[PDB]
Amino acid sequence: SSQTLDRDPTLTLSLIAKNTPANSMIMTKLPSVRVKTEGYNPSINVNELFAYVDLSGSEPGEHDYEVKVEPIPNIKIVEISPRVVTLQLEHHHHHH
User: Which regions span the lipid bilayer (predicted)?
Assistant: First the structure.
């Protein structure tokens, strides 16, 4: 195609829950984020890299949370979309 390739791979990381208490029960299946990166990795794994949602501030309900991707060594993060994911945190404590 081109003489010099752009060399900008798109890393697909799974979204996980970090610092997530059991009080905040995610009933939303966790999707995957597709980050455009300036940096080539024949060794680095997309299972080695993860994108997490910080649930330190456990706000129950359908709430928008930021997809926080772990910094990639020697590789630039260009995109982080979907940048925000709407996750429904359900109460693990109910009345009835």
Answer: none
